[PDB]
Design a protein around this ligand. Structure first.
Ligand SMILES: CC(=O)N[C@@H]1[C@@H](O)[C@H](O)[C@@H](CO)O[C@H]1O
Ligand SMILES: CC(=O)N[C@@H]1[C@@H](O)[C@H](O)[C@@H](CO)O[C@H]1O
Lengths: 286, 286
């Protein structure tokens, strides 16, 4: 009993102690260090030792969910995009090799998917999870219940989909939070800089907010269409902080998916994840 | 806009940036430093500068909610219980003077009540708020909308109520959330040390868990009865971490309050707070 879980993303580092029965205690959310004067490895070390002293844990099982391409066996970040500077090469097993030899590392979306499936039951046999946020990532659980990470650990890096040579942009470069916030300013949305306010303003009938959301949702849908064509999944789950919007998110994306598929093509239902925040923390220990 | 809000408790320090429209962003929640080799002052300073850098805020309006007797004018902790060691004398106005002259400091319950009333409207003219958690605190907003803190700032230190000389224990020593954890252990509840698990177990028919909850609720009700008698409030709000149990906590307490009142005595409705986690973060800026 008493596992330590840490979920690292470009915006926040989340942590908690989880028991054998899936009960979460001592949740701790902090703004991600810049990885320049403040180090993610130092913050991760501090979180582990804090939980160790707090609960007198000897060689505890530590689970690590992280953005970036993850080599599970190595416990290492083999490639990272630009969101987290100087991240490539980060090895968590070596970092904590004095506190515990029991360290697991997974990609953020694999963790989110395993977590969501640990907490909620679905009829669908094939489930693809796509998270929207700082970055766009993916994970697929097949009919035999297996998640394939790829020959080089980079399966489902869906942010790399749909490179437009004339715009020099990937899916991620048009649909991640930093891109949407730039689209809000370009769209004429001066009201706020926060995505929830954009959603709120659109619910109130602000035409401006709606045009930004619909155009952005057009690109999200295009990416989902490619995922659908390839996997033919029973269910597509949308994860990430924006998952909080629920049906107010689905209503903008879901209908648009049909624009990139043939008229009689049946695609999977598109839904937000039921677990809106702690999914990856449970997933990294699975 | 952009106000910095920090809520310091014996268990955790929560922080967030809040805008003019009451939108909460960059929420953070860390375990409370031990205040020995790790200082709360340093962490608060660290949290404020971090938000200043992230948003390029100059002399930002800073709000501080804290457990302990608070001298609002001085912005200082005048007395603290045995929860946070070396807390007495902590002065937040002085500590943050190098960053902003706009600092406000309040007791955690005053902040909770002001916070809950800022996000939720009630018909009741007089509202008492009691929080259950690491300790037990209280606050009273009268029919004139004013909260009287007392001649020596210790008004509504409700944890000192009902001292029992045969047991050498106060209300706070029998009804504090951590007193409930001690009671679960002494009552033979080995299944877990997590209070929500005691609630789950009782819902599923665990008689030992039901007994621990009813005995504990009896002492909570007793304290509420004294508060009701003095104030005759229009509403009693229950805040604190245990407030997340909502109606499942109320069903244990409300009926029992009548046991310490006369047969035809009408007491106020007792409800959990609506803003469960962040009430104090909104309240400390009022
Ligand atoms: C190369 C890289 O960094 N890819 C990450 C991916 O691992 C992660 O799943 C996703 C969501 O956080 O964000 C991408 O940018
Ligand atoms: C003397 C003292 O510290 N009293 C605190 C009180 O200020 C606080 O409101 C309450 C809830 O946290 O806990 C009590 O123990």
């Amino acid at each position: 009993m008493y596992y330590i879980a840490i979920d690292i993303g470009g915006t926040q580092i989340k942590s908690a102690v989880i028991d054998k029965q899936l009960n979460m205690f001592d949740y701790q959310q902090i703004s991600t260090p810049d990885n320049k004067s403040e180090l993610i490895t130092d913050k991760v070390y501090e979180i582990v030792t804090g939980y160790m002293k707090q609960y007198q844990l000897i060689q505890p099982v530590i689970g690590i969910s992280s953005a970036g391409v993850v080599d599970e066996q190595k416990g290492e970040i083999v490639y990272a995009g630009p969101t987290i500077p100087n991240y490539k090469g980060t090895n968590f097993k070596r970092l904590l090799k004095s506190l515990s030899p029991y360290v697991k590392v997974k990609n953020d979306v694999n963790a989110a998917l395993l977590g969501e499936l640990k907490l909620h039951q679905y009829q669908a046999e094939r489930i693809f999870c796509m998270t929207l946020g700082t970055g766009i990532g993916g994970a697929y659980k097949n009919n035999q219940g297996h998640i394939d990470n790829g020959e080089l650990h980079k399966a489902n890096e869906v942010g790399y989909l749909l490179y437009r040579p004339t715009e020099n942009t990937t899916f991620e470069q048009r649909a991640a939070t930093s891109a949407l916030k730039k689209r809000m300013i370009a769209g004429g949305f001066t009201r706020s800089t926060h995505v929830p306010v954009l959603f709120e303003a659109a619910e109130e009938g602000d035409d401006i907010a709606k045009q930004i959301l619909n155009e952005w949702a057009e690109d999200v849908a295009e990416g989902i269409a490619q995922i659908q064509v390839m996997y033919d999944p029973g269910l597509i789950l949308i994860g990430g902080g924006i998952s909080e919007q629920g049906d107010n998110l689905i209503k903008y994306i879901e209908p648009k998916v049909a624009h990139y598929l043939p008229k009689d093509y049946v695609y999977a239902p598109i839904q937000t994840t039921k677990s809106k925040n702690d999914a990856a923390l449970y997933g990294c220990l699975q």
